[PDB]
Amino acid sequence: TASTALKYQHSALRVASATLHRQFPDTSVEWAPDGNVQKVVMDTVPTFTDHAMIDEIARVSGQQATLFAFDPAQDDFIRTTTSITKPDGSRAVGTNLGQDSKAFAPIKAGKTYLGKADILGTSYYTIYAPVFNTRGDVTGILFSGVKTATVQEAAN
Known part of the structure; x- marks a missing residue:
């Protein structure tokens, strides 16, 4: 269901944030008292030639993940x-979030977006967490999400 999938996204963000910190030890993850992710700090989000980390995050969480x-x-x-x-099988690297994405304005304001969102023409249940640098600027996004059709095929 929708509420179930959205509630799960908090767990997926924990997977993504902890794995990101292990791959990039110079990052910082602040955790809330209840164990959820509070803030992700990464000064420069780099370009990637190897995508094993994000596929690991996807396989562990059982859904999709992205670092903007x-x-x-x-x-x-x-x-x-x-x-x-x-659709041609290639990795969606190099595509943009888009100013029309429901996550755009919350991320720009430094807020975490939790809810439905469209990704390259497909609807997802998503969480978008802003990535900061040590000066407080928004330098990226840490995302996890699952296709609504996937949630729906399990309910079907």
Whole structure:
């Protein structure tokens, strides 16, 4: 169900944030008293040639995951590594979040978006968490999500 899938996204973000910190030890993850992720700090979200980390996060969480980098010249976020694939089988690296995404305005305000969102034409249940640097600027996004059709096929 919708509420069940959205509630699960908190667990997927814990998987993504802890794995990110192990791959990049110079990052920082602040955890809330209840064990959920509070804040992710990464000064520079890099470009990726190897995508084993994001596929590990996808396999462990059982859904999809993405790390965005903020491009100030575009005023948009670029998928630098992701488990999401295009219809031709290629990795959806290099695509943008888009200013029309429901996660765009919350992320820009430094807020975490939890709810439905469209990703390259497909509807998902998502969580989008902003990635900060040590100066407080929003430098990226840490995302996890599952296709609504996948949630629905299990209910069907």
